[PDB]
């Protein structure tokens, strides 16, 4: 950093040193200065990052506000699945084991109407000492 937060000094030092240098070799360096200049990478690039991410700070500040409004979707894909619970819970609590039961087997249909699209379903009992062996 000091090389170019004070580059005027560095270039002037090199220039007058080289002018007095060429003078001994019979050479009048009427002017001299630093054509090229660089450094390594990360003393170079990290004081850079210092103010880079003082703005990355605002980037994240504001991605926060994006997530605030993203996660409403996670709330709301389930909001209604829950009110349906509100309703049917006190429904068939007082009512009893009517559709507690019978949708099991409107299921059986809608279940395997689709299990047809599957191709390897199988089946066994209980009440015995039932004991499974299965195919490939």
């Amino acid at each position: 950093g000091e090389l170019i937060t004070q580059r005027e000094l560095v270039s002037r030092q090199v220039s007058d040193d080289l002018t007095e240098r060429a003078a001994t070799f019979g050479l009048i360096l009427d002017d001299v200065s630093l054509t090229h200049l660089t450094f390594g990478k990360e003393f170079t690039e990290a004081v850079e990052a210092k103010q880079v991410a003082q703005q990355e700070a605002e980037r994240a500040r504001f991605v926060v506000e994006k997530a605030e409004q993203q996660k409403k979707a996670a709330i709301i894909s389930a909001e209604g699945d829950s009110k349906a619970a509100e309703l049917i819970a006190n429904s068939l609590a007082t009512a009893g084991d009517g559709l507690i039961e019978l949708r099991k087997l409107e299921a059986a249909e809608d279940i395997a109407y689709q299990l047809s699209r599957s191709r390897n379903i199988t089946y066994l009992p209980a009440g015995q000492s039932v004991l499974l062996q299965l195919p490939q």
Binding site: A85, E86, I111, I121
Partner: protein, 149 residues
């Protein structure tokens, strides 16, 4: 390093000795100057790496800050999963109406999407229907009898 750092001293001493070495045999050296210099790396490698890392420290300090604050990103992320938990929580403490219903809309959409799957499912006492008259069937049916449930 002391060669790199004090290469001026090195070249000056070299010329100082070499001019008098040559002048013995009637040789006036106007100039004697070092044209090149080499090492393996290690001294200068570590010497460079020290300032590399000294400021790598800074390179990640402001990242510490960035992250201190990218964590209230997550703070707000999962108050979402917590107040949803509020209003699922105070909501359902009576009986398994929809928790079963949702086991069962699971049975619906789950194995609707098992289509995109290739599940090998294997099953149990009374799922597909057919303990039909085994007393296991009828006692697992007489839940309807209020007392056999």
């Amino acid at each position: 390093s002391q060669l790199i750092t004090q290469r001026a001293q090195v070249s000056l001493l070299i010329r100082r000795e070499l001019t008098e070495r040559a002048k013995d045999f009637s040789l006036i050296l106007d100039d004697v100057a070092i044209t090149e210099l080499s090492f393996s790396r290690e001294y200068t490698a570590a010497v460079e790496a020290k300032q590399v890392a000294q400021q790598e420290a800074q390179r990640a300090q402001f990242l510490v800050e960035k992250a201190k604050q990218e964590q209230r990103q997550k703070i707000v992320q999962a108050e979402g999963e917590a107040e949803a938990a509020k209003m699922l929580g105070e909501a359902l403490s009576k009986n398994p109406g929809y928790i079963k219903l949702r086991k069962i809309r699971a049975a619906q959409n789950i194995s609707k999407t098992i289509a995109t799957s290739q599940n090998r499912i294997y099953l149990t006492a009374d799922n597909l229907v057919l303990n039909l008259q085994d007393e296991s069937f009828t006692r697992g049916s007489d839940s309807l009898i209020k007392g056999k449930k």
